[PDB]
Amino acid sequence: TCNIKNGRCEQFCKNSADNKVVCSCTEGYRLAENQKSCEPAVPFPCGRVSVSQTSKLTR
């Protein structure tokens, strides 16, 4: 159920039959293959930093 750790759903969790769980994401994202995490379905999904800030890393 969604009781613990949001039912492992990265974003939204809704309780289904037999204590099962149905995850979902917000506009601009898509429920991955594992029905758990959320992935960018557009060039600039809401709420995410894409500038990476500064300039000094492996990338």
55, amino acid identity:
S
Q: Which helix (H) or strand (E) holds 15?
A: strand 12-15
User: Is residue 51 at the binding interface for other proteins, with CB under 8 A as the rule?
Assistant: yes
**Residue 2 CB, nearest approach to other proteins (Å):** 10
Taking CA atoms, 4 is separated from 8, 9, 15, in Å, by 8, 10, 12
Report the site for other proteins in 3-42 (rule: CB under 8 A).
Answer: 10-12, 26-29, 38
Contacts to other proteins by CB under 8 A: 10-12, 26-29, 38, 43-51, 53-54
